[PDB]
Amino acid sequence: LRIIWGTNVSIQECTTNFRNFLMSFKYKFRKILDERDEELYYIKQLNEMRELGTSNLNLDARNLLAYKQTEDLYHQLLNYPQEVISIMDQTIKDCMVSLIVDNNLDYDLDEIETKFYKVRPYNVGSCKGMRELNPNDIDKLINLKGLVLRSTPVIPDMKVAFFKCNVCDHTMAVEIDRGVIQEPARCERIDCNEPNSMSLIHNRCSFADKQVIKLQETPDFVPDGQTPHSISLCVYDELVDSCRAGDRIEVTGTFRSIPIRANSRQRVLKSLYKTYVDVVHVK
Amino acid sequence: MSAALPSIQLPVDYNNLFNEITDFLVTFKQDKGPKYMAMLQKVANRELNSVIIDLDDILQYQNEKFLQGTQADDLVSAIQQNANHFTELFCRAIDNNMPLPTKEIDYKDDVLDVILNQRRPPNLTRRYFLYFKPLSQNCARRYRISSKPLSVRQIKGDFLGQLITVRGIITRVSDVKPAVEVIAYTCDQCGYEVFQEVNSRTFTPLSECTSEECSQNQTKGQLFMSTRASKFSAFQECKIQELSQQVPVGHIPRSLNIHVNGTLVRSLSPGDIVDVTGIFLPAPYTGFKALKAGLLTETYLEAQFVRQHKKKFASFSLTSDVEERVMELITSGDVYNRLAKSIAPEIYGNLDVKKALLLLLVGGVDKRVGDGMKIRGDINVCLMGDPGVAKSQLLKAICKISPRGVYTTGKGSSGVGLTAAVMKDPVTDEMILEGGALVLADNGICCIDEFDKMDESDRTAIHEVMEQQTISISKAGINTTLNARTSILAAANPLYGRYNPRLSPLDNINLPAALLSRFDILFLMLDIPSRDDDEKLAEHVTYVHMHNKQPDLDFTPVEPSKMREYIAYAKTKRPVMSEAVNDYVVQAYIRLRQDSKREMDSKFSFGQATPRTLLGIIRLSQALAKLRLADMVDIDDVEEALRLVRVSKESLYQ
Ligand SMILES: Nc1ncnc2c1ncn2[C@@H]1O[C@H](COP(=O)(O)OP(=O)(O)O)[C@@H](O)[C@H]1O
Ligand SMILES: [Zn+2]
Ligand SMILES: [Zn+2]
């Protein structure tokens, strides 16, 4: 047995079931959903994409709903999407090189080991706007439909905390730890010991890219007395300059929460958490 | 120091409090098994999220103890006080004894119960909110009170936190949003958790490692927090405003605030009669730091339960008595004209128009094209006519009885108060919008008076509404195409007060038919003497002014509670149209078209019948079928439709 704390999610079993569903999916949903030639629905994606060098992929929910061995995966990518996807990004490279074993190739292997992978669940179970998200169901794969009002500029974020020691012709380096930096006050004791002598430069460090988008919500049902809302969210890098004003959109993401400061002055906060959404895919 | 904080005592005794409670929590069998405990089994089944508290049952167990000669040991007399302390005692009494899950946990259930069972203060172990509700005095008078419907103005200060019921009206509530009750702080190094507790609006976070293993440690590895382990529960506010008939003389009434949490946040919508229940409670404000003398308090109240004398349409479901109500209603017969008799009997006669209002309430039937369009089952009505005759009793009875109802004047704040606003919200930085008179109505009713006196703008908007149920705006922030789904009922007078019998209604009336084509119905209600009819008119007027009781017919027109009941149940069907009626309707259309065109281009001639005329005939025939409560249409109805249509203008010819 292997398992995560507060969780019912196996890594390697998910990998195996993922792989078996992956080797086995042939327009099943045509069969099991309805009455509606071809073969191995998914696998063609994964055969074609290799020579073109892309670290992305899209994905339905229904094809899990169709295949036998994926019905439990549905409720688990649902509840733990970033975790289930931290799995699947590994299971995907695993399936890649377990599928390359049947092939001899020119030496493209200098890259795929250096590569990353990521997924995009798009056509998913419907959700009823915003009002439904009483706090029971925060942080979950979600879908929505609406249009655009306002676009912000780019938020950067420290991604490599560079650090310049003051002496001993030495730099220093340290990375982010659940979204903070803990500056090493010390001075690398061996060469020099000045327990709070170090500096900081930005031009060195690595920056993320984040953007926020104002959106207007356009449901299919509303209650007795309803009216528009305007929601903000967060997209991140490699998705920038995609969605803007003048577009209706069907979308997905994750609903979440966050507090804000009382000021630019101290750490005293609000009992009530401003809500938002982090982004997973856009249609 | 016994000077500060000296000793003192009361009759309050928590030791018997807890035993009394927890014996009550299990001795309930008078109204599965101990159904309170069966509900607990449901809670173990994760069926509900909020426990319910009946209190006449607590009275009844005190009656048990009394009848058995036990010290009944009354707590309600205390619980009506200081309720904010009782809540975290009741929760402890239940956590003490929650039965076991008769069903199993799985991957398809609440994602929280799994973590509960994984790690299997006490506040984060609570999978259950509580929301009280007080007694209705009908039972307090059984065996022999405390909380009557009270005012924004009649607090009397001393009623802070005591048990109370307030009435009034909700203007504006913000949207529901989440708020902490308990933090989940975990350690990087110790691997252990910390429970930082807040009840204020604010706090200051806990950064340095005060952990229990780091206590016995030089180094103090940093801790951080969760986004799921940390407890949450929502927080939403609402403003009552006071009821008219209880404002004293010449007095401008005033405002109030309430706070709600969690489950019941969805049972409130602006514009309704309400009886909020709960407790009126303080909070930290002192004015603003110059006009002060210390100890000052801004304040609020606790939400725990909502009743409203106005039952919206989506709360309908039959049972073993209301179906009996509909039965004995339908049994008498003459049901249609009986209704249109019972509509506002304060005013005399004109059953044809009472019937038309009834049909406006029905609205019609919604139909979808399935090709990117639908069409309204909705009505729009008007009652042109001279003054003198009654006009406004109608609209006031309407907004009295119909829910989601609205009155406006003609002129005044018609510029935007029929339209969408822009506003910042108090409890949270956000740019909310609340709408005019109409948008508070949707799937409901409006009323208007002195239409002719209104602006060209109101005409521009209503010319949209009557046909299409949207509103379009291009002024500022608001760029919507907003949904109305409303039902118009205006009124006005002609240009000369009394009619011009030597001019046409198409000249005598002030409004254009470029709009009035949308007006599927139109009555012309003018008055000419007669020696005999006005005699018993005065009889009617005089008997009603003698005592409010209407004429002593062998007949009982009935409350609007029951009336909205029947309307809601008849709103449930969606009947069908045969061809046997379709063809006859087609022929009548062609008849009226050619007849009105070639003949009525003359003295007493209004325009020309339209497709909209036909569509309205159809909608109203549907409604007749909805009232008979059969899913098809009889030929016996279209006759009443066209009868009433050509009847509307009979008095144009006398
Ligand atoms: N047929 C009637 N029976 C009894 N009272 C009437 C009748 N017609 C008018 N009235 C009285 O005269 C008044 C008429 O006002 P109304 O016609 O409703 O508004 P407006 O004249 O501004 O359109 C009412 O207060 C009503 O009590
Ligand atoms: Zn150094
Ligand atoms: Zn520690």
PDB file of C-alpha atoms in Angstrom, chain B residues 425-615:
ATOM      1  CA  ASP B 425     -21.341  46.927  -1.148  1.00  0.00           C
ATOM      2  CA  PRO B 426     -20.824  47.586   2.589  1.00  0.00           C
ATOM      3  CA  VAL B 427     -19.533  44.292   3.899  1.00  0.00           C
ATOM      4  CA  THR B 428     -17.091  43.718   1.028  1.00  0.00           C
ATOM      5  CA  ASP B 429     -15.325  45.720  -1.637  1.00  0.00           C
ATOM      6  CA  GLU B 430     -17.291  44.912  -4.773  1.00  0.00           C
ATOM      7  CA  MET B 431     -19.304  46.689  -7.448  1.00  0.00           C
ATOM      8  CA  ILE B 432     -22.790  45.264  -7.057  1.00  0.00           C
ATOM      9  CA  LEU B 433     -25.970  46.229  -8.861  1.00  0.00           C
ATOM     10  CA  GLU B 434     -29.543  46.359  -7.639  1.00  0.00           C
ATOM     11  CA  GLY B 435     -32.282  47.167 -10.078  1.00  0.00           C
ATOM     12  CA  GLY B 436     -35.291  49.340 -10.399  1.00  0.00           C
ATOM     13  CA  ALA B 437     -38.893  48.532  -9.778  1.00  0.00           C
ATOM     14  CA  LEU B 438     -39.090  45.971 -12.544  1.00  0.00           C
ATOM     15  CA  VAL B 439     -35.993  43.930 -11.920  1.00  0.00           C
ATOM     16  CA  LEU B 440     -37.053  43.237  -8.383  1.00  0.00           C
ATOM     17  CA  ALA B 441     -39.859  41.531 -10.261  1.00  0.00           C
ATOM     18  CA  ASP B 442     -39.173  38.491 -12.442  1.00  0.00           C
ATOM     19  CA  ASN B 443     -41.428  35.483 -12.898  1.00  0.00           C
ATOM     20  CA  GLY B 444     -43.869  37.716 -11.007  1.00  0.00           C
ATOM     21  CA  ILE B 445     -46.050  40.841 -11.344  1.00  0.00           C
ATOM     22  CA  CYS B 446     -45.795  44.617 -11.653  1.00  0.00           C
ATOM     23  CA  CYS B 447     -48.360  47.417 -11.610  1.00  0.00           C
ATOM     24  CA  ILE B 448     -48.318  50.930 -13.103  1.00  0.00           C
ATOM     25  CA  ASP B 449     -50.653  53.912 -12.927  1.00  0.00           C
ATOM     26  CA  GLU B 450     -50.874  57.072 -14.996  1.00  0.00           C
ATOM     27  CA  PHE B 451     -48.866  55.600 -17.795  1.00  0.00           C
ATOM     28  CA  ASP B 452     -49.586  58.622 -19.989  1.00  0.00           C
ATOM     29  CA  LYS B 453     -47.805  60.839 -17.466  1.00  0.00           C
ATOM     30  CA  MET B 454     -44.557  58.898 -17.660  1.00  0.00           C
ATOM     31  CA  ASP B 455     -41.473  59.716 -19.669  1.00  0.00           C
ATOM     32  CA  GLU B 456     -40.602  58.625 -23.219  1.00  0.00           C
ATOM     33  CA  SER B 457     -37.797  56.620 -21.545  1.00  0.00           C
ATOM     34  CA  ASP B 458     -40.145  54.364 -19.621  1.00  0.00           C
ATOM     35  CA  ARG B 459     -41.906  53.824 -22.911  1.00  0.00           C
ATOM     36  CA  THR B 460     -38.624  52.875 -24.594  1.00  0.00           C
ATOM     37  CA  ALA B 461     -37.988  50.264 -21.960  1.00  0.00           C
ATOM     38  CA  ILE B 462     -41.435  48.791 -21.653  1.00  0.00           C
ATOM     39  CA  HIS B 463     -41.704  48.590 -25.456  1.00  0.00           C
ATOM     40  CA  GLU B 464     -38.853  46.146 -25.092  1.00  0.00           C
ATOM     41  CA  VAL B 465     -40.236  44.326 -22.071  1.00  0.00           C
ATOM     42  CA  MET B 466     -43.775  43.501 -23.176  1.00  0.00           C
ATOM     43  CA  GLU B 467     -42.542  41.474 -26.157  1.00  0.00           C
ATOM     44  CA  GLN B 468     -39.000  40.512 -25.189  1.00  0.00           C
ATOM     45  CA  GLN B 469     -38.153  39.756 -21.575  1.00  0.00           C
ATOM     46  CA  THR B 470     -34.747  41.458 -21.684  1.00  0.00           C
ATOM     47  CA  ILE B 471     -33.378  44.904 -20.948  1.00  0.00           C
ATOM     48  CA  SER B 472     -30.427  46.466 -22.752  1.00  0.00           C
ATOM     49  CA  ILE B 473     -28.233  49.185 -21.272  1.00  0.00           C
ATOM     50  CA  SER B 474     -25.187  51.062 -22.531  1.00  0.00           C
ATOM     51  CA  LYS B 475     -24.566  53.814 -19.931  1.00  0.00           C
ATOM     52  CA  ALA B 476     -21.574  52.947 -17.709  1.00  0.00           C
ATOM     53  CA  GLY B 477     -20.158  49.808 -16.020  1.00  0.00           C
ATOM     54  CA  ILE B 478     -23.501  48.171 -16.553  1.00  0.00           C
ATOM     55  CA  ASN B 479     -23.471  46.842 -20.143  1.00  0.00           C
ATOM     56  CA  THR B 480     -25.920  44.035 -19.605  1.00  0.00           C
ATOM     57  CA  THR B 481     -28.621  42.294 -21.499  1.00  0.00           C
ATOM     58  CA  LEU B 482     -30.506  41.671 -18.289  1.00  0.00           C
ATOM     59  CA  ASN B 483     -33.406  39.318 -17.693  1.00  0.00           C
ATOM     60  CA  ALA B 484     -36.796  40.703 -16.685  1.00  0.00           C
ATOM     61  CA  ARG B 485     -39.378  37.917 -17.117  1.00  0.00           C
ATOM     62  CA  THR B 486     -42.104  40.224 -15.867  1.00  0.00           C
ATOM     63  CA  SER B 487     -45.770  40.922 -16.425  1.00  0.00           C
ATOM     64  CA  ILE B 488     -46.984  44.507 -17.082  1.00  0.00           C
ATOM     65  CA  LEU B 489     -50.232  46.074 -15.965  1.00  0.00           C
ATOM     66  CA  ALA B 490     -50.480  49.826 -16.463  1.00  0.00           C
ATOM     67  CA  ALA B 491     -53.260  52.391 -16.301  1.00  0.00           C
ATOM     68  CA  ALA B 492     -53.914  55.962 -17.321  1.00  0.00           C
ATOM     69  CA  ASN B 493     -56.770  58.186 -18.460  1.00  0.00           C
ATOM     70  CA  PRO B 494     -57.587  59.773 -21.795  1.00  0.00           C
ATOM     71  CA  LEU B 495     -56.830  63.357 -22.729  1.00  0.00           C
ATOM     72  CA  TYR B 496     -60.141  64.923 -21.651  1.00  0.00           C
ATOM     73  CA  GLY B 497     -60.923  62.928 -18.522  1.00  0.00           C
ATOM     74  CA  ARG B 498     -64.278  61.768 -19.758  1.00  0.00           C
ATOM     75  CA  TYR B 499     -64.636  60.117 -23.100  1.00  0.00           C
ATOM     76  CA  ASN B 500     -65.166  61.841 -26.431  1.00  0.00           C
ATOM     77  CA  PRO B 501     -67.981  59.721 -27.902  1.00  0.00           C
ATOM     78  CA  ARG B 502     -67.765  61.746 -31.100  1.00  0.00           C
ATOM     79  CA  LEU B 503     -64.075  60.850 -31.499  1.00  0.00           C
ATOM     80  CA  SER B 504     -62.506  57.408 -31.773  1.00  0.00           C
ATOM     81  CA  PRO B 505     -60.550  55.535 -29.113  1.00  0.00           C
ATOM     82  CA  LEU B 506     -57.669  55.767 -31.601  1.00  0.00           C
ATOM     83  CA  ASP B 507     -57.789  59.586 -31.290  1.00  0.00           C
ATOM     84  CA  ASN B 508     -59.301  59.993 -27.835  1.00  0.00           C
ATOM     85  CA  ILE B 509     -56.523  57.903 -26.306  1.00  0.00           C
ATOM     86  CA  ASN B 510     -53.064  59.398 -25.906  1.00  0.00           C
ATOM     87  CA  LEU B 511     -50.767  56.407 -26.541  1.00  0.00           C
ATOM     88  CA  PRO B 512     -49.536  55.171 -29.941  1.00  0.00           C
ATOM     89  CA  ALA B 513     -50.508  51.837 -31.334  1.00  0.00           C
ATOM     90  CA  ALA B 514     -46.924  51.390 -32.505  1.00  0.00           C
ATOM     91  CA  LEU B 515     -46.575  50.246 -28.905  1.00  0.00           C
ATOM     92  CA  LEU B 516     -50.135  49.224 -28.210  1.00  0.00           C
ATOM     93  CA  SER B 517     -49.967  46.478 -30.810  1.00  0.00           C
ATOM     94  CA  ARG B 518     -48.039  44.716 -28.068  1.00  0.00           C
ATOM     95  CA  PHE B 519     -51.034  45.175 -25.779  1.00  0.00           C
ATOM     96  CA  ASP B 520     -52.814  41.933 -26.349  1.00  0.00           C
ATOM     97  CA  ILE B 521     -55.723  43.107 -24.192  1.00  0.00           C
ATOM     98  CA  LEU B 522     -57.251  46.534 -23.862  1.00  0.00           C
ATOM     99  CA  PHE B 523     -60.388  47.594 -22.028  1.00  0.00           C
ATOM    100  CA  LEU B 524     -62.120  50.985 -22.360  1.00  0.00           C
ATOM    101  CA  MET B 525     -63.846  51.612 -19.037  1.00  0.00           C
ATOM    102  CA  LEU B 526     -66.060  54.701 -19.295  1.00  0.00           C
ATOM    103  CA  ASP B 527     -69.257  55.693 -17.507  1.00  0.00           C
ATOM    104  CA  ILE B 528     -72.698  56.868 -18.623  1.00  0.00           C
ATOM    105  CA  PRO B 529     -75.684  57.263 -16.265  1.00  0.00           C
ATOM    106  CA  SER B 530     -78.666  55.005 -15.820  1.00  0.00           C
ATOM    107  CA  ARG B 531     -81.506  55.372 -13.335  1.00  0.00           C
ATOM    108  CA  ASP B 532     -81.389  51.734 -12.227  1.00  0.00           C
ATOM    109  CA  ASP B 533     -77.815  50.442 -12.148  1.00  0.00           C
ATOM    110  CA  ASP B 534     -76.414  53.188  -9.933  1.00  0.00           C
ATOM    111  CA  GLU B 535     -79.096  52.562  -7.294  1.00  0.00           C
ATOM    112  CA  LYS B 536     -77.693  49.210  -6.329  1.00  0.00           C
ATOM    113  CA  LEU B 537     -74.223  50.581  -7.090  1.00  0.00           C
ATOM    114  CA  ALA B 538     -74.762  52.895  -4.188  1.00  0.00           C
ATOM    115  CA  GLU B 539     -76.202  49.969  -2.276  1.00  0.00           C
ATOM    116  CA  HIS B 540     -72.916  48.126  -2.805  1.00  0.00           C
ATOM    117  CA  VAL B 541     -70.741  51.160  -2.043  1.00  0.00           C
ATOM    118  CA  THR B 542     -72.764  51.986   1.033  1.00  0.00           C
ATOM    119  CA  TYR B 543     -72.789  48.468   2.457  1.00  0.00           C
ATOM    120  CA  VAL B 544     -69.045  48.170   2.032  1.00  0.00           C
ATOM    121  CA  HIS B 545     -68.536  51.533   3.637  1.00  0.00           C
ATOM    122  CA  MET B 546     -70.966  50.456   6.351  1.00  0.00           C
ATOM    123  CA  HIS B 547     -68.876  47.514   7.327  1.00  0.00           C
ATOM    124  CA  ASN B 548     -65.860  46.344   5.306  1.00  0.00           C
ATOM    125  CA  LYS B 549     -67.568  42.970   4.857  1.00  0.00           C
ATOM    126  CA  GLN B 550     -68.617  42.626   1.208  1.00  0.00           C
ATOM    127  CA  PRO B 551     -72.240  41.912   0.184  1.00  0.00           C
ATOM    128  CA  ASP B 552     -73.731  38.993   2.090  1.00  0.00           C
ATOM    129  CA  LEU B 553     -73.966  36.677  -0.863  1.00  0.00           C
ATOM    130  CA  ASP B 554     -74.322  32.963  -0.364  1.00  0.00           C
ATOM    131  CA  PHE B 555     -70.625  32.797  -1.240  1.00  0.00           C
ATOM    132  CA  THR B 556     -67.197  32.924   0.416  1.00  0.00           C
ATOM    133  CA  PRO B 557     -64.345  34.420  -1.594  1.00  0.00           C
ATOM    134  CA  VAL B 558     -61.173  33.168  -0.093  1.00  0.00           C
ATOM    135  CA  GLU B 559     -57.757  34.141   1.219  1.00  0.00           C
ATOM    136  CA  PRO B 560     -54.848  34.735  -1.151  1.00  0.00           C
ATOM    137  CA  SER B 561     -52.810  32.097   0.609  1.00  0.00           C
ATOM    138  CA  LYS B 562     -55.149  29.475  -0.790  1.00  0.00           C
ATOM    139  CA  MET B 563     -55.322  31.444  -4.027  1.00  0.00           C
ATOM    140  CA  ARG B 564     -51.569  31.468  -4.618  1.00  0.00           C
ATOM    141  CA  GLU B 565     -51.716  27.808  -3.628  1.00  0.00           C
ATOM    142  CA  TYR B 566     -54.095  27.022  -6.493  1.00  0.00           C
ATOM    143  CA  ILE B 567     -52.178  29.281  -8.884  1.00  0.00           C
ATOM    144  CA  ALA B 568     -48.967  27.494  -8.100  1.00  0.00           C
ATOM    145  CA  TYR B 569     -50.464  24.050  -8.617  1.00  0.00           C
ATOM    146  CA  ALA B 570     -52.010  25.115 -11.913  1.00  0.00           C
ATOM    147  CA  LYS B 571     -48.612  26.530 -12.890  1.00  0.00           C
ATOM    148  CA  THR B 572     -47.334  22.950 -12.821  1.00  0.00           C
ATOM    149  CA  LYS B 573     -48.920  21.691 -16.032  1.00  0.00           C
ATOM    150  CA  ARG B 574     -48.123  22.401 -19.660  1.00  0.00           C
ATOM    151  CA  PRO B 575     -51.079  21.277 -21.749  1.00  0.00           C
ATOM    152  CA  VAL B 576     -51.463  20.484 -25.429  1.00  0.00           C
ATOM    153  CA  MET B 577     -53.391  21.905 -28.365  1.00  0.00           C
ATOM    154  CA  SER B 578     -55.332  19.592 -30.689  1.00  0.00           C
ATOM    155  CA  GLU B 579     -55.962  20.279 -34.380  1.00  0.00           C
ATOM    156  CA  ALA B 580     -59.742  20.293 -33.876  1.00  0.00           C
ATOM    157  CA  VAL B 581     -59.315  23.646 -32.118  1.00  0.00           C
ATOM    158  CA  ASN B 582     -56.393  24.857 -34.237  1.00  0.00           C
ATOM    159  CA  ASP B 583     -58.443  24.991 -37.419  1.00  0.00           C
ATOM    160  CA  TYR B 584     -61.298  26.880 -35.762  1.00  0.00           C
ATOM    161  CA  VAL B 585     -58.836  29.349 -34.324  1.00  0.00           C
ATOM    162  CA  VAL B 586     -57.357  29.871 -37.780  1.00  0.00           C
ATOM    163  CA  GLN B 587     -60.763  30.605 -39.237  1.00  0.00           C
ATOM    164  CA  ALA B 588     -61.648  33.048 -36.465  1.00  0.00           C
ATOM    165  CA  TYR B 589     -58.348  34.825 -37.027  1.00  0.00           C
ATOM    166  CA  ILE B 590     -59.031  35.279 -40.723  1.00  0.00           C
ATOM    167  CA  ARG B 591     -62.585  36.397 -39.943  1.00  0.00           C
ATOM    168  CA  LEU B 592     -61.502  39.089 -37.525  1.00  0.00           C
ATOM    169  CA  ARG B 593     -58.623  40.199 -39.735  1.00  0.00           C
ATOM    170  CA  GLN B 594     -60.637  40.850 -42.870  1.00  0.00           C
ATOM    171  CA  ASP B 595     -63.622  42.135 -40.885  1.00  0.00           C
ATOM    172  CA  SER B 596     -61.723  44.681 -38.807  1.00  0.00           C
ATOM    173  CA  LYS B 597     -59.675  45.837 -41.763  1.00  0.00           C
ATOM    174  CA  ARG B 598     -62.354  46.383 -44.381  1.00  0.00           C
ATOM    175  CA  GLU B 599     -65.094  47.440 -41.965  1.00  0.00           C
ATOM    176  CA  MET B 600     -63.372  49.089 -39.006  1.00  0.00           C
ATOM    177  CA  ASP B 601     -61.435  51.951 -40.576  1.00  0.00           C
ATOM    178  CA  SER B 602     -63.974  54.293 -39.108  1.00  0.00           C
ATOM    179  CA  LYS B 603     -65.525  55.900 -36.002  1.00  0.00           C
ATOM    180  CA  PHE B 604     -65.256  53.190 -33.328  1.00  0.00           C
ATOM    181  CA  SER B 605     -62.317  51.406 -34.962  1.00  0.00           C
ATOM    182  CA  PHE B 606     -59.078  50.522 -33.175  1.00  0.00           C
ATOM    183  CA  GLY B 607     -56.318  49.540 -35.591  1.00  0.00           C
ATOM    184  CA  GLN B 608     -56.359  45.928 -36.732  1.00  0.00           C
ATOM    185  CA  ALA B 609     -56.088  42.507 -35.076  1.00  0.00           C
ATOM    186  CA  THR B 610     -52.606  40.988 -35.323  1.00  0.00           C
ATOM    187  CA  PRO B 611     -50.565  37.835 -35.040  1.00  0.00           C
ATOM    188  CA  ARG B 612     -49.999  38.930 -31.474  1.00  0.00           C
ATOM    189  CA  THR B 613     -53.761  38.834 -31.050  1.00  0.00           C
ATOM    190  CA  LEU B 614     -53.679  35.233 -32.143  1.00  0.00           C
ATOM    191  CA  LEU B 615     -50.703  34.375 -29.968  1.00  0.00           C
TER     192      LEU B 615
END
